[PDB]
Amino acid sequence: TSWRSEATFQFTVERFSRLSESVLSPPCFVRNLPWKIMVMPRFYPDRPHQKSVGFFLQCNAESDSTSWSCHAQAVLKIINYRDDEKSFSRRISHLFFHKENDWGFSNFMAWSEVTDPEKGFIDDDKVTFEVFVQADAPHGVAWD
Ligand SMILES: [Ca+2]
Ligand SMILES: [Ca+2]
């Protein structure tokens, strides 16, 4: 159910080379909360072309609630279509709540690397992002 404790979901960004804003994946429910992948181009002077791929995990952002929380561990990965041994991923641990509903990397990968038609992260101008997330939740199992 949507109350599962963990899940793995993907988000394929099409016409990637033309991405000019931040885009969100549809919601994946874990612990009855909507989790989404956020992807956007970011400016980094030292990178080749001063451009990098921003990749973040977002939780329950549309809710107006200010009384929720979810501590989660996750793996943020850009899938390598050709070799599963060559995918690039980074792990995070963060307490998600209304004031800090997203967490990730603004310089996840060089824009020139992800779009290199020879490295295996892009195909037909499409890049696929994946997140494995495990989250906890409050409950009433307590005792005197
Ligand atoms: Ca947007
Ligand atoms: Ca109880």
CATH number, residue 81: 2.60.210.10
User: What is the span of the domain harbouring residue 10?
Assistant: 1-144
In contact, 19 and 40? CB cutoff 8 Å? yes
6, HSE (Cβ side, Cα atoms, 13 Å):
8
Cα 60 to middle of ligand 2, angstroms? 25
Q: Tell me how many domains the chain contains.
A: 1
**Cα distance between residue 101 and residue 36, in whole Å:** 10
The technique by which this structure was obtained is: X-ray
Question: Chain centroid to CA 74: how far?
Answer: 9
**Cα distance between residue 84 and residue 138, in whole Å:** 36
For residue 142, the ligand closest to its alpha carbon is 2
Cα 21 to middle of ligand 1, angstroms? 5
For residue 140, the ligand closest to its alpha carbon is 2
In contact, 107 and 44? CB cutoff 8 Å? yes
In contact, 74 and 91? CB cutoff 8 Å? yes
Cα 22 to middle of ligand 1, angstroms? 4
For residue 139, the ligand closest to its alpha carbon is 2
Q: Are strands 28-30 and 33-43 parallel, antiparallel or unpaired?
A: antiparallel
